[PDB]
Design a protein around this nucleic acid. Structure first.
Ligand SMILES: [Zn+2]
Ligand SMILES: [Zn+2]
Length: 56
DNA sequence: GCCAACGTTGGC
DNA sequence: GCCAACGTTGGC
């Protein structure tokens, strides 16, 4: 694997899923269909996440 | 065995 | 070159 948490940015410090972004809504637990399978947009690490996963 | 989400690629 | 889509995998 590649480490995807720097651990010290506002995204990594965030506690809970936002429950409103495209990735959250897609989670089965939020009622989505699991077609995207990514972590909350607002929990995507600002240093280590692929840039396409950051908020837009 | 489940499952969050990583990591690869077919199709553009 | 890009990413939507989903197969995979580490942690539990
Ligand atoms: Zn979210
Ligand atoms: Zn971070």
């Amino acid at each position: 694997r590649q480490n995807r948490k720097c651990g010290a940015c506002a995204a990594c410090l965030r506690r809970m899923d936002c429950g409103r972004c495209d990735f959250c809504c897609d989670k089965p637990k939020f009622g989505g269909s699991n077609q995207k399978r990514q972590k909350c947009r607002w929990r995507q690490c600002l240093q280590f996440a692929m840039k396409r996963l950051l908020p837009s």
